[PDB]
Amino acid sequence: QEISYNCDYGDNTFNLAIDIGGTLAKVVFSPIHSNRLMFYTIETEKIDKFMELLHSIIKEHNNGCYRMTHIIATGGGAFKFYDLLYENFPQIKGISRFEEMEGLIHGLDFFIHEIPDEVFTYNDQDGERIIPTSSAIYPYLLVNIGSGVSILKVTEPNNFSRVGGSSLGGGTLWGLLSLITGAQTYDQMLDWAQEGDNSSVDMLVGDIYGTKSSAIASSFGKVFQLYSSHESIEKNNGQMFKNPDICKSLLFAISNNIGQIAYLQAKINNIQNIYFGGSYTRGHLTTMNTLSYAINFWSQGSKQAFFLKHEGYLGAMGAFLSAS
Amino acid sequence: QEISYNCDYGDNTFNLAIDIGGTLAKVVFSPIHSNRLMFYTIETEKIDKFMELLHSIIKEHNNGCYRMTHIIATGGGAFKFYDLLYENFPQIKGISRFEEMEGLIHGLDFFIHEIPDEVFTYNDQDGERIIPTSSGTSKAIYPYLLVNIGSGVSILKVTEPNNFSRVGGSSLGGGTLWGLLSLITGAQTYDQMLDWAQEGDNSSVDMLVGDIYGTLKSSAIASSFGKVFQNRNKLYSSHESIEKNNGQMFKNPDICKSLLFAISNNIGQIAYLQAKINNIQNIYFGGSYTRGHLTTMNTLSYAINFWSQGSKQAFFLKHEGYLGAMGAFLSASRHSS
Lengths: 324, 337
Ligand SMILES: [Mg+2]
Hints:
Two copies of one chain form a homodimer.
Chain A: E1 2-4, E2 14-20, E3 25-29, E4 36-42, H1 47-61, E5 69-74, H2 82-88, E6 94-97, H3 100-114, E7 119-123, E8 127-131, E9 140-146, E10 148-156, E11 159-166, H4 170-181, H5 186-195, E12 203-204, H6 205-209, E13 216-218, E14 241-242, H7 243-268, E15 273-278, H8 285-299, E16 304-308, H9 314-323
Parallel strand pairs in A: 2-5, 5-6, 9-15, 15-16
Antiparallel strand pairs in A: 1-4, 2-3, 3-4, 7-8, 7-16, 9-10, 10-11, 12-13
Helix pairs in contact in A: 3-9, 4-7, 5-7, 7-8
The complex binds magnesium ion (MG).
PDB class: transferase
Keywords: ssgcid, NIH, niaid, Seattle Childrens, UW, UCB, Pantothenate kinase, PanK, CAB1, Structural Genomics, Seattle Structural Genomics Center for Infectious Disease, transferase
Assembly: dimeric
């Protein structure tokens, strides 16, 4: 992924911003005098393999010149991993930090105000509609979904604060689905969710009250439904459930819950505009429709969900900008 | 778990109130002239056992007098099971339905105002404290929120006597917790899940704040189940397949504790947010979810206390699962008086 942008290279430095999250690392960088912003994401399971990516970026995109490279660490792990970064990059020009929430908002404000065709709405009926934000904006909520959910309130440029988030985020969904279905990739989980029918494992309004009917009353609610002396308890231990239906059920459960909490926070704070960031939606139409419908449903259309083409890079983008 | 209460028995109709949820049926009745309220719960899964309990109640506590028994059904299942009740009780005096929300609030208000030793607070530091709501000394009682947790989560706001309405609830309730843990861990009963949760350590599957930020407190949960995908064309999955793949990589008590915290913290947060929106300080929990389980009650209480900086308070009920059946019972008692 790349964006054309006339960057300022007055410091003659290769700036490399890294958002160090709980599960994923996101980098934003620009080869000097290239006027291209580049974006990359890695799954930092083994910290060794994440340092090795940074080395490869410096080698491939700055001629291996550590002395002309400045690293900006952001994300939740920025202050934590600062010393380790210095241990791993002794020849670096410098390493600085940028606080997580300020990184997110500076990066989001940059994408809203500077980058065209970056903000969009999505639902299954109207499709994707690009919002010409870089051509009303404030106040807004940013719901940043990754390792847990962070929710930030922005009333005007450079004025933001944290409101209550949630531990039921992308890591919960991927962790549950990985363990239950054995899926190894987010794309396998989302492909299954797209085809699945949650009604085989969810209790719907119709299932409680008998024959909106398709509204979910209890996510996964259909599943639970001295010494040995009788037959083994293998009848219930052997009940089987469809992987696509499980994926759709838990994608709905997690996304609808995020959307509700986001709605309630926007209601408390008198906010109409809700941006979703982080690596959660992945541009997937089912996930986006679910989050957008949740906001529309609870507000009867008086609040609006917005998505971002570079949703996963908000924090690293803000950190990149803080360098120069 | 009976209660003494001086009832007027009217024309001596034996009122049998049933709250039928997604998985449980809750029954309230009073033998004629006994001045005792009696309570029983049974799963609805096996219909013959559910109906057999109601027959046993009539035979043992109303001398087998079907002709003077009135069944009043409430809860979501009151519609789905109406024909079953008609089929199973052909000699009965009558069968009626009572609206779900009205049942819950009429029952809760009765317990709050009339029944001693019924409302209590609990957390790990303070222990259990009984609240004397039924004694002398409205501005302390109303307004309040009822968070009724069964398969899903229903949330009702009560501003004053007879003034109540529904607000946004949640599909992540007890059915979600039970469904996930029974599939993943093979727990046989809700009580076994709770015992396993009591023993577990969620830090082996959850990402804590300290995991991400180093040194919200460090021990707070940042990502429920967040260590699992990190450390991790078949159509069907089962417990056996999950178990045969996981292979003790993640321990069942740790999984139970993590998801108990995740579901409970989430319910507490949504309750807090609805109470914030509606400027309510008193939050009652109803249903079959807390079950007097200290860890669950502490978790819910801490969530409300945390987000509100101490200004809101979680309340629990000794007869939490019976609110709707109690409301229905009171309506039928009024009709037969
Ligand atoms: Mg610094």
